[PDB]
Amino acid sequence: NWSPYDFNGGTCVAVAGADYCVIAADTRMSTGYNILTRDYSKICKLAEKSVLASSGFQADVRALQKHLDARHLIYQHQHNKQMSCPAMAQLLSNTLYYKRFFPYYAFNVLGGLDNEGKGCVFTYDAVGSYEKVGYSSQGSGAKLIMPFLDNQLKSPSPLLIPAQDAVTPLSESEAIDLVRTAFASATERDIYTGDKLEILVLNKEGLRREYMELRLD
């Protein structure tokens, strides 16, 4: 009779730099073919150096964000320190999988700075499996973004045994423009992406926030 899920579209992108991490996601929210709001933020700042950007069912996205925030506050109180990014990634994986048999309908992309200060981006299923990758994007427009990002930011795999070196790392001003271009191209061709683009640029100086105007129609 009734469906306990809804697909609210939007898309999130994360780009991991050598010393930073750029996370972006448009502010559109919708159901069916009508826009509910144009200022729904996908990005949540989970820790001082982690930032969760997720797309999918909005109620489940918020439930997951609040659950992780509460669990982080508990961790802070117990262990008297702020959860590192990879620990948050592991916690998120376990939390997603605990609801294996009634999953969150959220597609998450953690970004952040690890202990040593290198940006690290974790990309998730809806059931918990995750990887550490140099970039990612999830949601409606993800498939439109991936080919361009892949073409523009390719590095020898981390699994090659005679390690084949690494590609010249990209500075921040270039990752920002790359994310801008990705969302421009995704909005042109996806009905679920558009409005603004919140580009949280974590650094060693603390995270900023930037906005760009995507097309409305």
Binding site: K66, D69, A70, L73, I74, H77
Partner: protein, 231 residues
Amino acid sequence: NQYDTDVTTWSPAGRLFQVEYAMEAVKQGSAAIGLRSKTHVVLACVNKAQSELSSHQRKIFKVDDHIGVAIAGLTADGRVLSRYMRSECINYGFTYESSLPVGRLVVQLADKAQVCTQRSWKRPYGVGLLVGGLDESGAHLYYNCPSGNYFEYQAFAIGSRSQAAKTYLERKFDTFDGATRDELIKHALFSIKETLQGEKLTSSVCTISVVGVGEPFQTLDQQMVQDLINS
């Protein structure tokens, strides 16, 4: 005196002796101070290590961005009550996405404490919490005795040798209401000095944590309190 072995046995004088033993447990704690203005609460605690080599036991704690706790009495129960208060503040934040008012947390805490003083198999908590946080009205300071009662003061002190600090505050509490952050910090330092038995005050004996209408909870660092004491 035979009205003394079980909590649920009133004494013929109208007294409850196990509860009074719990309330005595606090008096063996170290001096936990607290003093309030209309915007700020300052919890200061005197630290007594059990040896030259061994270190002290922590007594100030954070409950959320706007509430702090200074416990006296046995620590095994201070830990459970602090964990409960943190959990409640987190749950309220989760449900209403707003900070839990001090007063309501304190009253829930007093209910939790009283519940133990009424059942045969349970025992009172034996830890006296001195809650200080923020409400829409501004700053607030409470005290929760293991008896399940709670009070509100412009300033207060508990624990062993807490009478000297209490007696200094009773001289100066008229001023706290309108006092700035620095003046409350100064009053906390002096109220501690009154507790020290002829020792010159130093940062190494007490820790001061302050919460304010614009500031989250914080425990002042070892060196800044030392520099302030050098005045």
